[PDB]
């Protein structure tokens, strides 16, 4: 559809978790999603011919 496209990547998961008998809720991790927006451009060229006879 040549609409502006948007690709997404999943960032790698980092950050220290939880040690020992500690609740998962003491250090949540963040699922991080990055994106890009690709917009189209229009471009062109043209040749103008001379009189048919020539």
């Amino acid at each position: 559809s040549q609409q502006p496209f948007r690709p997404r990547i999943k960032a790698q998961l980092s950050g220290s978790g939880v040690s020992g008998n500690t609740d998962f809720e003491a250090n949540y991790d963040n699922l991080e999603i990055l994106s890009q927006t690709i917009y189209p451009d229009a471009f062109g060229n043209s040749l103008r011919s001379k009189i048919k006879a020539y």
């Binding site: 040690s19 020992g20 008998n21 500690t22 609740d23 003491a26």
Partner: protein, 126 residues
Amino acid sequence: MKQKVHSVSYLAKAEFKFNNGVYNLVALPSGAEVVKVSLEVVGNPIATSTTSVSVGFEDETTKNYFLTLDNLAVDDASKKHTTSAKDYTATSNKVVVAEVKNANDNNVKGVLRVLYFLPSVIEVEY
């Protein structure tokens, strides 16, 4: 490094009307770790306001364990919010109570905010 921490916390907000008497404001269970006790005054204590308010416990002779408050009109900017300098651990079920005496002003009100942790503990390691 292990430890045991309190994880469950409650805030109790009670409201009383600055008349001569006692008010059973906050119910503490045994083992409650009181970490904040604050009294907000609501209203305009008029001049000649000889009203005295003390936040303490119910089962004590002088119910002023946490706060004493007097001469509200001396400076309505600082005597309007007064927090307690003392934390507390409840050995038994306690009742935080406000004792109001010599109430000579009208439409003045008090709000007691008590932030306390529950006796329950969990074991955490960092």
